[PDB]
Symmetry: D2
Subunit: 245 residues, 4 copies
Amino acid sequence: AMKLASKTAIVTGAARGIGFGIAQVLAREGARVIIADRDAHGEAAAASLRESGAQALFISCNIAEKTQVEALFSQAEEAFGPVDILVNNAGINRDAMLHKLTEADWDTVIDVNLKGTFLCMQQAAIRMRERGAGRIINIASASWLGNVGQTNYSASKAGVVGMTKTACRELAKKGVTVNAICPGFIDTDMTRGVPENVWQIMVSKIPAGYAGEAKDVGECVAFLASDGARYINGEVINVGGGMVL
Amino acid sequence: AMKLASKTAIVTGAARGIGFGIAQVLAREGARVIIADRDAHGEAAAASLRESGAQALFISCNIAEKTQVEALFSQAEEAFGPVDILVNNAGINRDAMLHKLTEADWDTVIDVNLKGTFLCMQQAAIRMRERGAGRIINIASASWLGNVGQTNYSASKAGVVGMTKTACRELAKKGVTVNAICPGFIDTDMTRGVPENVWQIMVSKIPAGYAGEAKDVGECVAFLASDGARYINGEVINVGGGMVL
Amino acid sequence: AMKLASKTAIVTGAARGIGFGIAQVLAREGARVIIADRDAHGEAAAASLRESGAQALFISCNIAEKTQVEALFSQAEEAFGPVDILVNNAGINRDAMLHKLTEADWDTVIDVNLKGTFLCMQQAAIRMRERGAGRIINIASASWLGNVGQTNYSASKAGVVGMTKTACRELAKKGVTVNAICPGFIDTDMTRGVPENVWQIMVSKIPAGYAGEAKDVGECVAFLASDGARYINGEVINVGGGMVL
Amino acid sequence: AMKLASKTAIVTGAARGIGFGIAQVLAREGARVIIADRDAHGEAAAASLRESGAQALFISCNIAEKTQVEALFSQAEEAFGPVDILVNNAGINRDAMLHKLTEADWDTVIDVNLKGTFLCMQQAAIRMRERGAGRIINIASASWLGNVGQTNYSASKAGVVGMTKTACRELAKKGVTVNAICPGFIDTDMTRGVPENVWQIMVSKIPAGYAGEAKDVGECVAFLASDGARYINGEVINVGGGMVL
Ligand SMILES: NC(=O)C1=CN([C@@H]2O[C@H](COP(=O)(O)OP(=O)(O)OC[C@H]3O[C@@H](n4cnc5c(N)ncnc54)[C@H](O)[C@@H]3O)[C@@H](O)[C@H]2O)C=CC1
Ligand SMILES: NC(=O)C1=CN([C@@H]2O[C@H](COP(=O)(O)OP(=O)(O)OC[C@H]3O[C@@H](n4cnc5c(N)ncnc54)[C@H](O)[C@@H]3O)[C@@H](O)[C@H]2O)C=CC1
Ligand SMILES: [Cl-]
Ligand SMILES: [Cl-]
Ligand SMILES: [Cl-]
Ligand SMILES: [Cl-]
Ligand SMILES: [Cl-]
Ligand SMILES: [Cl-]
Ligand SMILES: [Cl-]
Ligand SMILES: [Cl-]
Ligand SMILES: [K+]
Ligand SMILES: [K+]
């Protein structure tokens, strides 16, 4: 009934969008969910999961700062014990054409999407490699293989895939799986913030014929986090309705 | 609790090995399973499933002949109703170096592994595209990106991945998902034939440090067959403990 | 002065389109070219190369038939000596939706594009693995990763990529390189035969903004065939102006 | 004749190893070469290219500082005219296991390998988009798809590949090609430091049976930088004797 019962999970950027969708599917499978986010709306997201009957806790955290990541994993374990699942979802966009991208927009996107994902992966690796069990699921983007106006975003997401495949080689023998999910075009506050015509152009590229939901990504994460996906490691699973960006 | 309940699934080459493991997982999820295979032992395989408390039926069929594939879907529907899931696993080996592969061994591997997967996929498409729903899951091989002494096998499995991505672009808008699985080194009777010393050397190369089971491939098939994996389409998922052949 | 000077090369389907473009560039680099094709127009193509000051010979041949492929290499070696370069370009199209592709259109495309490419590669392997030197360049398609209405073509081209990687692993230690080229959309008689709206839709996908020329593919073949590309093996190079089909 | 005559090329980190090998091949093809590196030995490198009868110049430059990258392109064009070719070879290693990598070793590798490549790519894009012609060749690593003890290096090289494909989509219409090269195990003065028993293990992973040379990478750069490779764009070409890291 609940393939993730008795498992603690940390989901970064789970205050809204895809992150909250993953927290909802993990919580539904009986997992204790730690909502890690820099926005105080994460408390409304945790209170929403507890009201549905699940066990959830919000922990304010800027994954770009190592001291806050160390504090995140410390409080999470003092709250729901050992962390068995890590979902690196936290991400941001500062789009610009290569010839216009500012050094500031470059630094912020790489510091959060790439270094941020590194600092979290590291705290999970230090623990999971000793316990001989663990699940690391990184959210990348279909943009990891190129996308106009996303020099900094494609670089960070492509970097997340490289790390995912490196972590697989170092933690696989420790009974840990590290996999990446590349969501195509999902319906969230970020995608609803783009202009009308931009929405239709993207949906016209989706063979399924519609923008995915945050739970579509959550269903794939819940599977990789289960014991049934123990032989899937270092993979990149596209959840974009067959879209080829 | 029974995600595949009320769904009929056809699994080719499921008399023994990986195909039977996939049949056991689909059955465990309360799915009516059809075991299609030339091997007569398939009758004892379907019986083993009816003994576990599931509904199963063996159909002696040669997927290389279109007239027998047309009979497979006809006989499968009048029994358990509309076919919602198709698992193309049937795949034989006739290994030989490129400079010595006989024209006969080539034709046998291609006619069964590639043309066979096409004939089954075609019959599933004619039906699923009208019912506006369906699941096609092709079992290909880590050998699709090359492997010594497998020119005919690498060609066939690489071809299966090519059709998989093509079917995705033609059946996605009809609500049908077409995905492929590439198993690594799976511990089965057929594989427990090579020298034990070569087998231990092969396992030392798997990052996970152990050979997978037929159910490992099944757990992934059961997920792609669920409604929760409706947005995963045209994907190649490796089930080899993070191994790169 | 000329990189491929003193080298004999066989180019299948070099009577027109990409094949003749490849033959023109190889000849420009001082390579003795063997125009292998099933159309008698290859005799005009070979004469056009001899009139340009290069050495060329046409040999009628259906790569689908092994006895005719064996006769091709025999006549090619007694004519210009040992074959140092093999370019598998010969290919056909019998496009149709998965639910309508006839068994005849399936057999013909797989027998030419896949089995035909194999029979040629096999004759090159038998000779090159003994001479300790060689070059095998297979023309695949950007459709190897899927394309609407090309279930048989994608399967055949994907199969060639799989074989390209298998051959690499078996002949790399012999000093032979096996590489594949995936042309995007090249301006030829076949491509100029499709409707005008299809031409604009295909060209609108090319970031470069135009359909490539036959010599663009030939320039890449001339490089892989040189000694400078002795450390490139088992690669899939796209020559489609950055098109992502 | 020489395919790169009258062309100005910038090769970062070309004072030694692969970088200097790339400069030698570009010089041999008649291209003016700007050696950009923090290593003062870059003067002896440029002088060695002038002794061979080519036009070479050394410009001390820290690619992590945008003001020095802006001065590099300014001083480079004032001396040898418009920059037609940009080779991003600059790279460093600060290897460590995921659970040990210091924040400092992470920052220096990302600041030089990823941000450094970005700053140079940006100065090239700003100039090449107005001229309507140009070549950007990024040297990534076989480590972009993962490698033990290289979380930071695999992240920076995978990121370079991500940028490569993004720049392709934004500069293809402007007549500019952006490609990446992934060298496998290359023999350089920066690799003959490990014991031979370590060298043998790495070589047994190379199907070619031997480690490559700096010029094997240079030959591929000279081709992509030629007018004949104008239709190759957004590609990742492996130069590792068919080795799969
Ligand atoms: N939505 C889409 O269509 C696609 C998005 N993605 C990725 O999916 C992830 C989530 O996407 P959305 O839900 O649309 O994003 P969103 O912007 O709607 O929500 C992201 C959440 O991450 C949090 N966050 C951002 N930076 C953070 C940091 N440094 N530390 C902690 N929390 C931080 C924000 O507070 C926010 O709650 C991102 O990594 C995004 O790049 C991937 C491809 C497609
Ligand atoms: N033209 C394009 O845009 C693209 C073409 N390709 C591939 O490039 C190759 C050449 O394409 P095009 O020049 O446009 O085609 P084409 O039809 O103009 O020329 C192909 C040549 O192959 C020969 N041929 C066909 N079957 C043969 C057989 N069984 N034995 C011997 N010769 C045979 C034909 O006589 C013809 O001369 C084909 O393999 C094609 O699939 C792939 C990507 C795109
Ligand atoms: Cl700036
Ligand atoms: Cl920040
Ligand atoms: Cl949702
Ligand atoms: Cl499970
Ligand atoms: Cl033979
Ligand atoms: Cl034979
Ligand atoms: Cl039919
Ligand atoms: Cl530190
Ligand atoms: K994949
Ligand atoms: K490639």
